[PDB]
Design a binder for these strands. Structure first.
Lengths: 59, 59
RNA sequence: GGGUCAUCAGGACGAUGACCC
RNA sequence: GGGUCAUCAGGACGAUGACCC
Protein backbone atom coordinates (compact mmCIF):
# COMPACT_ATOMS: atom_id res chain seq x y z
CA UNK A 1 0.00 0.00 0.00
CA UNK A 2 0.93 3.66 -0.49
CA UNK A 3 -0.87 5.93 2.01
CA UNK A 4 -1.05 9.73 2.08
CA UNK A 5 -3.33 12.68 2.98
CA UNK A 6 -5.26 15.16 0.83
CA UNK A 7 -7.67 18.05 1.34
CA UNK A 8 -11.16 18.50 -0.11
CA UNK A 9 -10.84 19.98 -3.61
CA UNK A 10 -7.45 18.37 -4.39
CA UNK A 11 -6.25 15.38 -6.45
CA UNK A 12 -3.97 12.31 -6.77
CA UNK A 13 -2.67 10.36 -9.82
CA UNK A 14 -2.18 6.68 -10.75
CA UNK A 15 -0.77 4.68 -13.69
CA UNK A 16 -0.06 7.94 -15.60
CA UNK A 17 -3.56 7.54 -17.16
CA UNK A 18 -5.78 7.70 -14.05
CA UNK A 19 -6.58 10.60 -11.70
CA UNK A 20 -8.55 10.88 -8.45
CA UNK A 21 -10.17 13.93 -6.84
CA UNK A 22 -11.49 14.22 -3.26
CA UNK A 23 -14.64 16.22 -4.06
CA UNK A 24 -15.55 16.74 -0.38
CA UNK A 25 -16.63 15.14 2.92
CA UNK A 26 -19.93 14.36 4.64
CA UNK A 27 -18.88 12.98 8.02
CA UNK A 28 -17.87 9.32 7.79
CA UNK A 29 -19.03 9.55 4.15
CA UNK A 30 -16.67 11.07 1.56
CA UNK A 31 -17.59 12.08 -2.00
CA UNK A 32 -14.80 11.20 -4.45
CA UNK A 33 -14.24 11.29 -8.22
CA UNK A 34 -12.21 9.16 -10.64
CA UNK A 35 -10.95 9.90 -14.15
CA UNK A 36 -9.62 7.14 -16.42
CA UNK A 37 -10.01 5.88 -20.02
CA UNK A 38 -12.74 3.29 -20.67
CA UNK A 39 -9.74 1.09 -21.53
CA UNK A 40 -9.91 0.40 -17.77
CA UNK A 41 -12.78 0.00 -15.28
CA UNK A 42 -13.78 1.40 -11.87
CA UNK A 43 -16.21 0.09 -9.23
CA UNK A 44 -16.78 -0.19 -5.47
CA UNK A 45 -14.78 -3.15 -4.12
CA UNK A 46 -18.01 -5.17 -3.73
CA UNK A 47 -19.26 -4.49 -7.28
CA UNK A 48 -15.80 -5.52 -8.50
CA UNK A 49 -16.18 -9.02 -6.98
CA UNK A 50 -19.31 -9.53 -9.15
CA UNK A 51 -17.08 -8.94 -12.20
CA UNK A 52 -13.74 -10.60 -11.38
CA UNK A 53 -15.71 -13.86 -11.01
CA UNK A 54 -14.92 -14.60 -14.69
CA UNK A 55 -16.05 -11.68 -16.89
CA UNK A 56 -15.83 -7.97 -17.76
CA UNK A 57 -19.27 -7.38 -19.33
CA UNK A 58 -22.23 -8.12 -16.96
CA UNK A 59 -25.89 -8.41 -18.01
CA UNK B 1 -15.33 11.41 -14.28
CA UNK B 2 -16.98 8.68 -12.20
CA UNK B 3 -18.11 10.09 -8.84
CA UNK B 4 -19.08 8.10 -5.73
CA UNK B 5 -19.45 8.12 -1.95
CA UNK B 6 -17.47 5.72 0.23
CA UNK B 7 -17.36 5.69 4.04
CA UNK B 8 -14.14 5.59 6.04
CA UNK B 9 -12.82 2.01 6.31
CA UNK B 10 -14.09 0.69 2.93
CA UNK B 11 -12.51 0.13 -0.50
CA UNK B 12 -12.84 0.64 -4.28
CA UNK B 13 -11.13 -0.88 -7.35
CA UNK B 14 -9.53 0.33 -10.61
CA UNK B 15 -8.42 -1.54 -13.74
CA UNK B 16 -7.70 -5.18 -12.90
CA UNK B 17 -4.52 -4.65 -10.83
CA UNK B 18 -5.26 -1.61 -8.61
CA UNK B 19 -7.24 -1.16 -5.38
CA UNK B 20 -8.06 1.92 -3.25
CA UNK B 21 -9.11 2.36 0.39
CA UNK B 22 -10.58 5.40 2.17
CA UNK B 23 -8.55 4.93 5.36
CA UNK B 24 -10.23 7.75 7.30
CA UNK B 25 -11.40 11.36 7.59
CA UNK B 26 -10.14 14.40 9.52
CA UNK B 27 -12.36 17.34 8.57
CA UNK B 28 -11.28 18.93 5.28
CA UNK B 29 -8.40 16.42 5.33
CA UNK B 30 -8.74 12.78 4.29
CA UNK B 31 -6.34 9.82 4.46
CA UNK B 32 -6.30 7.42 1.52
CA UNK B 33 -4.42 4.27 0.48
CA UNK B 34 -3.50 2.75 -2.88
CA UNK B 35 -2.47 -0.79 -3.79
CA UNK B 36 -0.89 -1.52 -7.18
CA UNK B 37 2.21 -3.19 -8.69
CA UNK B 38 5.39 -1.07 -8.89
CA UNK B 39 4.86 -1.55 -12.65
CA UNK B 40 2.72 1.61 -12.27
CA UNK B 41 3.16 4.91 -10.41
CA UNK B 42 1.18 6.87 -7.79
CA UNK B 43 1.75 10.41 -6.43
CA UNK B 44 0.15 13.64 -5.24
CA UNK B 45 -1.06 15.85 -8.11
CA UNK B 46 1.58 18.39 -6.99
CA UNK B 47 4.43 15.83 -7.14
CA UNK B 48 3.04 14.52 -10.44
CA UNK B 49 3.87 17.76 -12.30
CA UNK B 50 7.56 17.24 -11.38
CA UNK B 51 7.43 13.77 -12.98
CA UNK B 52 5.41 14.37 -16.17
CA UNK B 53 7.91 17.14 -17.00
CA UNK B 54 9.75 14.76 -19.37
CA UNK B 55 11.16 11.76 -17.48
CA UNK B 56 8.54 9.74 -15.52
CA UNK B 57 11.50 8.71 -13.31
CA UNK B 58 11.60 10.47 -9.89
CA UNK B 59 14.69 10.97 -7.71
C1' G C 1 -9.48 9.20 27.64
C1' G C 2 -12.48 12.01 23.96
C1' G C 3 -13.24 15.92 20.15
C1' U C 4 -11.20 19.43 16.52
C1' C C 5 -7.40 21.62 12.98
C1' A C 6 -2.94 21.51 10.25
C1' U C 7 1.89 19.96 8.14
C1' C C 8 5.71 16.80 6.24
C1' A C 9 5.89 12.58 3.15
C1' G C 10 6.08 7.42 0.16
C1' G C 11 4.53 1.65 -2.34
C1' A C 12 3.98 1.75 4.54
C1' C C 13 -3.74 1.23 6.65
C1' G C 14 2.89 6.47 6.42
C1' A C 15 4.67 9.95 10.13
C1' U C 16 4.37 14.48 13.18
C1' G C 17 2.74 18.94 15.32
C1' A C 18 -1.05 22.15 17.20
C1' C C 19 -5.92 23.60 19.69
C1' C C 20 -10.20 22.43 23.18
C1' C C 21 -12.61 19.47 27.27
C1' G D 1 -29.22 31.14 3.76
C1' G D 2 -25.81 28.09 7.01
C1' G D 3 -24.40 23.48 9.70
C1' U D 4 -24.89 18.12 10.52
C1' C D 5 -26.18 12.79 9.30
C1' A D 6 -27.56 8.95 5.99
C1' U D 7 -28.89 6.06 1.44
C1' C D 8 -28.99 4.70 -3.65
C1' A D 9 -25.38 4.61 -7.74
C1' G D 10 -22.18 5.15 -12.76
C1' G D 11 -17.47 7.04 -16.38
C1' A D 12 -21.54 12.28 -14.44
C1' C D 13 -17.42 17.24 -9.67
C1' G D 14 -23.69 11.63 -9.82
C1' A D 15 -28.50 11.80 -7.47
C1' U D 16 -31.83 11.78 -3.20
C1' G D 17 -33.69 11.76 1.67
C1' A D 18 -33.39 13.15 6.79
C1' C D 19 -32.06 16.29 11.28
C1' C D 20 -30.77 21.30 13.61
C1' C D 21 -30.46 26.90 13.54
Amino acid sequence: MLILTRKVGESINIGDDITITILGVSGQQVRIGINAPKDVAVHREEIYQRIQAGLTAPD
